[PDB]
């Protein structure tokens, strides 16, 4: 499997009117997110910045990237939709090239892209104002998880995949920034979770079981529990 071509990616995605201002690829690092936070922490403006790592402390079998966004100009109660928008971007960028029926793949709230029941990719948002750092990990050539390879992509072009992924990610971030109602609708159309019976595990061995009915303006899960609405903030759920 070839390495990423840093130069080609830059020619493609930067700049004008692209929202990506910078992009770097590094052979190795611990976290893409930490590296980016370190940079902001130290006074860097990381909005629009992409960091890709060939390996995170096997190498080059996943696409791992992180992006930075300035969120401060957006209402704090909509930040929660940013990590959701990111998964949609991953599913969208990867669906066209996939053997399975689109219906078998979907979004699992709040962090996961699933194909045929197995985790294709994960999303990690960490906030650090004025920024949020979105981290993506997609299994290209890798518990019970899955990869584009297992999914029929015979030879995946990480360069092409990363490139498409950044393009959708840019599209969704824009929609999120614009309070676009389509982002939420697109997210619902592809949710595995909505319409599903789910259990939410809560600290202390507590759990709630209900039917996921919607996602609220803040990105939280709405459960129908016997006709009462219970809303939960981002956390982990199990389908049933």
Author numbering: 8 to 64, 77 to 161, 168 to 265
Relevant lines from the article:
Hence, to eliminate the effects arising out of these differences, the Mtb-BirA structure (2.8 Å) was also determined with normal hydration for the purpose of comparison. Structures of dehydrated (dhMtb-BirA) and hydrated (hMtb-BirA) Mtb-BirA, were determined at 2.69 Å and 2.8 Å, respectively, using crystals grown under similar conditions. A noncrystallographic dyad exists between the two subunits in both hMtb-BirA and dhMtb-BirA structures. The pseudo-2-fold symmetric interface shared by two monomers of the asymmetric unit in both hMtb-BirA and dhMtb-BirA is ascribed to the C-terminal domain involving β11 strands and loops L11 (between β8–β9) and L13 (between β10–β11) of two monomers. The presence of water molecules in the hydrated structure keeps this loop in a closed-compact conformation.
Acetyl Coenzyme A Carboxylase (ACC), an important enzyme that catalyzes the first reaction of fatty acid biosynthesis, is biotinylated by biotin acetyl-CoA carboxylase ligase (BirA). The Mtb-BirA molecule is composed of two domains; N-terminal domain 1 comprises of 7 β-strands (β1: 29–32, β2: 55–59, β3: 82–88, β4: 124–126, β5: 131–133, β6: 137–147 and β7: 150–158) and 6 α-helices (α1: 13–20, α2: 39–48, α3: 95–114, α4: 173–176, α5: 183–203, α6: 206–215), while C-terminal domain 2 is a SH3 domain with 5 strands forming an antiparallel β-sheet (β8: 220–227, β9: 231–240, β10: 246–250, β11: 253–257 and β12: 261–264). The two domains are linked together with loop L10 (216–219) that connects helix α6 of domain 1 and β8 strand of domain 2. All the apo BirA crystal structures have revealed the presence of disordered flexible loops, which undergo a conformational transition upon biotin and biotinyl-5′-AMP binding.
